[PDB]
Design a protein around this ligand. Structure first.
Ligand SMILES: *[C@H]1O[C@H](CO)[C@@H](O[C@@H]2O[C@H](CO)[C@@H](O[C@@H]3O[C@H](CO)[C@@H](O)[C@H](O)[C@H]3O)[C@H](O)[C@H]2O)[C@H](O)[C@H]1F
Length: 300
């Protein structure tokens, strides 16, 4: 139903819109790293998230380092499983080249180009696909102008040769927080968005103002990762500040994916230990974070 109705997504005047020009907001879940918790990524769990939580997008977090794709490329087939499930379920899907410790996206740029060529060749005639080319650039030596923008100006043409206009999300500096610099020096492709990530454990007032600054320059923003915990993924759940951010995103038409769908014993995890990897969870099988996120998406 979702993808049949909204179909081809595009950016118009800095906003995500559907094929009839109407604003659309995606809300869903990110996997944790596919190398650690891939059992939670399957048609049945995604169907349960679609039907019971109301998700309309699923993000497949394919770490590059930390035992991910560069070390063992088999995780790309789990991305394909997720994409095909999203097509069968009629929801959107984010293919996330999940850099982190490999803090400059240029480190594995050759591999990224090949990976995105493959995925855009396979899936580029489906409207479901959203490409996320560099999760979280980070470090004071990784800047928008010098590192990230040129990286994107190499990867985007590869995708565009196969898929002229599905959405591409591009990470920003300082762990996808520095939308100010990106918005002052935007990419040329008209169907690009810039990533912005937040954690409710951080006091967020200035970060909201910076997202507004970016939006005021005509830049489109996708909140492709956020958590209810601290920046580490652990250390408490901060539902007051999470709700502030939820409301802000609704006011600004910002799409989002929550981190993350796993039973790991960390506060940002959505599931408890014993949660079935194929869905069907009871209340007791959702963590404090997962219960909150499910509520947000069902409310929407
Ligand atoms: C965006 O931020 C989230 C945190 O809010 C990041 O997710 C965290 O990434 C950590 C680093 O990969 C991860 O910890 C690792 O978990 C592995 C599997 O259990 C361990 O083997 C490893 O020792 C540990 O460092 C957190 O569990 C996770 O929440 C996300 O990557 C960022 F994009």
């Amino acid at each position: 139903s979702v993808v049949e109705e909204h179909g081809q997504l595009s950016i118009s005047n800095g906003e995500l819109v559907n094929e009839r020009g109407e604003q659309v907001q995606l809300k869903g879940m990110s996997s944790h790293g596919l190398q650690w918790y891939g059992q939670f990524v399957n048609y049945e769990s995604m169907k349960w998230l679609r039907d019971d939580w109301g998700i309309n997008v699923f993000r497949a977090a394919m770490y590059t380092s930390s035992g991910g794709y560069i070390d063992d490329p088999s995780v790309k087939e789990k991305v394909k499983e997720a994409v095909e499930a999203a097509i069968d379920l009629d929801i959107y899907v984010i293919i996330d080249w999940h850099i982190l410790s490999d803090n400059d996206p240029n480190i594995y740029k050759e591999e990224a180009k090949d990976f995105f060529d493959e995925m855009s060749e396979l899936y580029g005639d489906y409207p479901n696909v959203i490409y996320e080319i560099a999760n979280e650039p980070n470090g004071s030596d990784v800047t928008w102008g010098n590192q990230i923008k040129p990286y994107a100006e190499e990867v985007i043409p590869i995708i565009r040769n196969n898929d002229p206009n599905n959405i591409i999300i591009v990470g920003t500096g300082t762990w996808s927080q520095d939308v100010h610099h990106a918005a002052d020096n935007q990419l040329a492709d008209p169907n690009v968005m810039y990533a912005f990530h937040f954690y409710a454990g951080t006091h967020g007032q200035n970060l909201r103002d910076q997202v507004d600054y970016a939006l005021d320059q005509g830049a489109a923003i996708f909140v492709s990762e956020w958590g209810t915990s601290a920046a580490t993924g652990d250390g408490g759940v901060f539902l007051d500040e999470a709700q502030v951010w939820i409301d802000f995103m609704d006011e600004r038409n910002l799409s989002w994916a929550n981190w993350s769908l796993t039973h790991k014993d960390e506060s940002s995890a959505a599931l408890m230990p014993g949660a079935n990897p194929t869905g069907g969870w009871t209340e007791a099988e959702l963590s404090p974070s997962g219960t909150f996120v499910r509520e947000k998406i069902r409310e929407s």
